Design a protein around this ligand. Sequence first.
Ligand SMILES: CN(C)c1cc[n+](Cc2ccc(-c3ccccc3)cc2)cc1
Length: 353
Amino acid sequence: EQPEPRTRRRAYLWCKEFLPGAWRGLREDEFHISVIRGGLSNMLFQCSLPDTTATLGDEPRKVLLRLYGAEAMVLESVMFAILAERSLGPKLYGIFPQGRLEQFIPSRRLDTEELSLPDISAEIAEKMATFHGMKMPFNKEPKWLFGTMEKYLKEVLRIKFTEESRIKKLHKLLSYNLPLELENLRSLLESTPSPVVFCHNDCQEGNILLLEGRENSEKQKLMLIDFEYSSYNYRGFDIGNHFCEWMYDYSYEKYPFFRANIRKYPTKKQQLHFISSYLPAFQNDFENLSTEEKSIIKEEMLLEVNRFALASHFLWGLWSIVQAKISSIEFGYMDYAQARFDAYFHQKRKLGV
Ligand SMILES: CN(C)c1cc[n+](Cc2ccc(-c3ccccc3)cc2)cc1
């Protein structure tokens, strides 16, 4: 797909002015661009040199253009630049009011089923442990989790839908008495020790790259991307959120445009495999501990992450209701909220909370 003529010309100018080497001498009529993701906001394009133009230094031959569309920008930009310097995320080539030029990384995204592959899960754990070791210049108070759940709750209780099915669905969702349940959840998570770390906060399969050519490689075949929700937070949340994502498939091509399967949440066996990879990646002298000491740490982690997984359901369930009101993307947001709340109570029953 080709962009609007206007966009082609703005993109040409950004590449010409922000990129070194052959980009500086490029003629408009040899500039290549294609739409990766359309929409009104956060549009993605691939921009590239012609095959007939040689690289003059180490300028990239292909780049990703991200267009914003329609304080948060300061923090997002700084975070992205820092992660790029530290080689955790894609390189940053250009920043401007309308968007960014980022490294283009040949890859495809993982699907839901691939999250359960032992080899894949172990590397996700290592990548997340590496991400959790980042020191960042942002607020280190863990206010994000309940701060955000409270804000969303307030928004949800003020929604006035007009469409009949959404009115009905919301009435069912609010019938549980969410303020009390949120404060019971707050109570439980307060008594659940969990270190505050820099978390991704959105570790779903759609945010993990399987790097081109590395498919048959043992380690180092993945990259975590899309950091826009990252913040200091309880470690249990990041891991528990990721576990939740085993159950949801966003590639269903018919309404409600997702599939939920409770039976696909990781077994305790599968969780153990994941945390056994996470721990030595997070605390490097971990392997030097006695089998007994490692076992205690692992057991306590299992309880931590499964309690925090409840906050993933509660948060994204509320989030989804808000989206049903304010979004414009075709997706069964109310049905999705119901699925998250269904899982909240199912898991709560199983915990004995
Ligand atoms: C805002 N944030 C970090 C979230 C929000 C929602 N979720 C779960 C979720 C993921 C994808 C979707 C979705 C929405 C529209 C189209 C395809 C997938 C919905 C909910 C995870 C993290």
